């Protein structure tokens, strides 16, 4: 694959540091280091490839660049020269911060409302008020709902008080918030991943760690057990969903997993069978005894894997 980002990357690794420095100063740290690694280790070089890269650069120069004067590269310096020639007020610099602020406001709208809230909860309530006013109404309502009641009411009250609509101080406020997400994204919290990791573990060790974390913190252990939970009760799992998964899942696999599963689980899973399938499954459960628990757990894990596959499809909310 060669995306528009990747085409520019190939251009850079082909041309050299003379334009790479300008690209870096107009670029971001991770892509700078990616091109540095590309320079350190390169195996995408070919006699035709390099010429095609030059042709693609010429296309960018005649289209994306349109053979124009430096775009905000040397122009910003002449803009600063005009600013210096005019009153001693760096409005252009304030506009630069506003540009990042407006882009950050759009990013804030894109990114998760609760993460935005907890990144702004520590900040000033007036900061929260003005940023919520300047944000999209839908994103603002999402963050409002994700706020606690008292903080939310204070934010709306200070929104009502907010009339100063200030002017360059607002831009640097957003810049500080962006810098508090500018740091490496991380997001390795994996609130689901503990649960996911324990599910990936063996079932007996899963139960042992569940008991251990119940001793550690009933709250955290209960959250982990909830993350273990996958189609255990019909009302939360949704019958239509039990209907859709289990026709995709092999009937024999469901049977083997059910005869090792609890009778409530058997009943709630068979309630979404075609009646012939439910009767056949129950009759075979009566016929054959509990097969090896290893095979029963294998069928249960296959059921969970198909649940995860349909979660990947995203047509309905699993449990």
Partner 1 sequence: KDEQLQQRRANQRLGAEVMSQRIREMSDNDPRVVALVIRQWMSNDHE
Partner 2 sequence: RIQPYHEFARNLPVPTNLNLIHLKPLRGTGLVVFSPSLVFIAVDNLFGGDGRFPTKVEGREFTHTEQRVINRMLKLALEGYSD
- In the complex, which residues of this chain contact partner 1 (CB under 8 A)? 4-5, 7-9, 11-12, 14-16, 18-19, 22-23, 26-27, 31, 46-51, 53-55, 57-58, 60-62, 64-74
Residue 158 binds partner 2 (CB under 8 A): yes
What is the distance between the alpha carbons of residues 21 and 42, in angstroms, rounded to a whole number?
19
Which listed residue (4, 25, 48, 188) binds its own copies by CB under 8 A?
188
Residue 22, contacted partner among partner 2, its own copies, partner 1, none, CB below 5-8 A by kind: partner 1
180 touches partner 2 (CB under 8 A): yes
Say if residues 136 and 111 touch (Cβ distance below 8 Å): no
Q: State both tokens at 37.
A: 């690694």
Q: Considering CB distances under 5 to 8 angstroms, the limit depending on partner class, which of its own copies, partner 1, partner 2, none binds residue 144?
A: its own copies
Applying CB under 8 A, what is the total number of residues that bind its own copies? 81
Query: In 10-23, which positions are buried (b, 16+ CB within 10 angstroms) versus exposed (e)?
Result: bbbbbeeeeebeeb
Of positions 5, 19, 52, 64, contacts its own copies by CB under 8 A: 64
CB distance 117 to 143 below 8 Å = yes
User: Does residue 206 touch its own copies according to CB under 8 A?
Assistant: yes
112: alpha, beta or left? (left if phi > 0; alpha if psi -120 to 50): beta
In this complex, which beta carbon is closest to its own copies, that of residue 45 or of residue 54?
A: 45
What are residue 316's phi and psi, to 5 degrees?
-145, 165
Which residues within the stretch 207-246 sit at the binding site for partner 2 (CB under 8 A)?
A: 216
Rg (C-alpha) for the chain, rounded Å, is 29
């Amino acid at each position: 694959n060669l995306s528009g980002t990747d085409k520019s990357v190939i251009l850079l690794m082909t041309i050299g540091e003379d334009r790479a420095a300008e690209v870096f100063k107009h670029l971001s740290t991770r892509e700078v280091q990616a091109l540095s690694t590309a320079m350190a280790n390169v195996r995408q070089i070919s006699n035709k490839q390099l010429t095609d890269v030059l042709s693609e650069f010429e296309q960018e120069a005649e289209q994306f660049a349109a053979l124009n004067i430096n775009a905000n590269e040397y122009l910003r310096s002449v803009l600063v020269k005009a600013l210096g020639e005019e009153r001693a007020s760096s409005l252009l610099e304030d506009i630069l911060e506003t540009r990042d602020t407006t882009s950050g406001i759009e990013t804030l709208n894109f990114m998760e409302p609760q993460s935005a809230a907890d990144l702004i909860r520590d900040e000033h309530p007036q900061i929260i008020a003005t940023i919520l006013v300047h944000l999209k109404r839908s994103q603002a309502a999402d963050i409002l709902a994700l706020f606690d009641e008292r903080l939310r009411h204070d934010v709306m009250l200070r929104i009502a008080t907010f009339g100063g609509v200030q002017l360059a101080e607002l831009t640097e406020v957003l810049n500080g918030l962006l810098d508090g997400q500018n740091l490496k994204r991380s997001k390795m919290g994996g609130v689901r991943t503990a649960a996911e990791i324990i599910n990936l573990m063996k079932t007996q060790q899963e139960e042992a760690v569940i008991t251990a974390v119940r001793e550690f913190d009933g709250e955290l252990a209960q959250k982990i057990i909830d993350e273990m939970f996958l189609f255990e009760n019909l009302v939360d799992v949704d019958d239509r969903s039990i209907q859709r998964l289990l026709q995709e899942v092999d009937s024999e696999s469901l049977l083997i997993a059910l005869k090792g599963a609890e009778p409530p689980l058997r009943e709630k899973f068979l309630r979404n069978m075609s009646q012939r399938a439910a009767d056949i499954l129950r009759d075979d459960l009566a016929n054959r005894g509990p097969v090896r628990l290893s095979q029963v757990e294998n069928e249960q894990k296959a059921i969970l894997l198909i649940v995860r596959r349909l979660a990947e499809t995203g047509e309905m909310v699993i449990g």
